[PDB]
């Protein structure tokens, strides 16, 4: 009914974003493990697998977040990478 139409129209899915690490030929594998542990709360085993995905697949998804939180993860990870003088790029794509 009218109430039911109002309900339908308020069920637009959240805008979510994958946060992604992109491979490069200069960033140490150990540093990527560090990144995944420090900023994404991965245990060492899971961090190591994702890091290997970055290296062998070209990129890996670190997790999926609201747009606001995703932009905050990207900013932090890149800052941490630059201050350690690595080119590691963390970016976003809409899920």
């Amino acid at each position: 009914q009218l109430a039911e139409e109002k309900v339908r129209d308020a069920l637009k899915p959240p805008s979510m974003y994958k946060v992604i690490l992109v491979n490069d030929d200069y960033t140490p594998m150990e540093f990527v493990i560090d990144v995944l542990q420090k900023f994404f709360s991965y245990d060492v085993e899971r961090a190591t697998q994702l890091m290997l995905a970055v290296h062998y697949q070209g990129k890996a998804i670190c997790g999926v977040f609201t747009a606001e939180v995703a932009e905050t993860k990207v900013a932090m990870v890149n800052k941490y990478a630059r201050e350690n003088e690595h080119p590691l790029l963390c970016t976003l794509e809409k899920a």
């Binding site: 491979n23 490069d24 030929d25 200069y26 960033t27 140490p28 594998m29 150990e30 990527v32 970055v54």
Partner: peptide
């Protein structure tokens, strides 16, 4: 990415 130097077991 860059793999770390392996640490030799045998001397």
């Amino acid at each position: 990415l860059v793999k770390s130097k392996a640490t030799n077991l045998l001397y």
